[PDB]
Structure 1
Amino acid sequence: DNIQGITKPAIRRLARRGGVKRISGLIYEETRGVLKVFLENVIRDAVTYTEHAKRKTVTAMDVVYALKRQGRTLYGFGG
């Protein structure tokens, strides 16, 4: 039950940070699919990075290069 382990009122909270008034009932599972393919495309690069690092622990450096390379660089956690 882990694909919809993140829940629908949390999706509403993220949507109402995003400024949309009314949301459908059929947008939850497609946002879950978008989220799933987004983390797939991120931790594929992150697990290649930690595979080449001769490490079993995924650190903050591998994930931060993984979103740096896709044009979505993130500040603060790169220290």
Structure 2
Amino acid sequence: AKRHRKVLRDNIQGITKPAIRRLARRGGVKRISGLIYEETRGVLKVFLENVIRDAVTYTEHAKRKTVTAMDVVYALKRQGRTLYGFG
């Protein structure tokens, strides 16, 4: 269209099909169905929602407005999954 490009791509579509494909290949999957993408996108969205909620609560308890790395480390440590190499 000459008037405008009219691009409304959603932000959740940032993780594209080859990214999920590489993740599955790293996980050890040979052949991948076509419906895996939406499912893993929803799973990633739920996980990020939980972790971000925990980190936001942690950083709001300290009255700070910047989400630091230690906040995410504590949020991950709360859910029984400790991450190393960041603090």
Following TM superposition, by how much is the alpha carbon of 1:65 offset from its aligned partner in structure 2, in angstroms?
0.3
Is the partner of 2:31 in helix, strand or coil?
Answer: coil
Aligned length: 78
State the alpha-carbon separation in 2 of the partners of residues 76 and 5 from structure 1.
Answer: 26
State the alpha-carbon separation in 1 of the partners of residues 64 and 78 from structure 2.
Answer: 21
Following TM superposition, by how much is the alpha carbon of 1:76 offset from its aligned partner in structure 2, in angstroms?
1.1
Following TM superposition, by how much is the alpha carbon of 1:4 offset from its aligned partner in structure 2, in angstroms?
1.4
Q: TM-score, normalised by structure 2?
A: 0.87
State the alpha-carbon separation in 2 of the partners of residues 3 and 50 from structure 1.
Answer: 24
| Structure with the larger RCO, 1 or 2 (CA within 8 Å, 6+ apart) | 1
Runs of 5+ in structure 2 lacking a partner?
A: 1-9
Structure index of larger Rg: 2
Q: Deviations over 1:33-56 (max 9, x none)?
A: 000000001010100001011111
The structure richer in strand per residue is 2
State the alpha-carbon separation in 2 of the partners of residues 53 and 10 from structure 1.
Answer: 36
The equivalent position to 1:20 in structure 2, one of 13, 26, 29, is 29
State the alpha-carbon separation in 2 of the partners of residues 67 and 40 from structure 1.
Answer: 12
Q: TM-score, normalised by structure 1?
A: 0.95
Following TM superposition, by how much is the alpha carbon of 1:7 offset from its aligned partner in structure 2, in angstroms?
0.5
In the TM superposition, structure 1's runs of 4+ consecutive aligned residues that sit over 3 Å from their partners are: none
Runs of 5+ in structure 1 lacking a partner?
A: none
Name the Cα RMSD after superposition. Answer: 0.6
State the alpha-carbon separation in 2 of the partners of residues 76 and 26 from structure 1.
Answer: 34
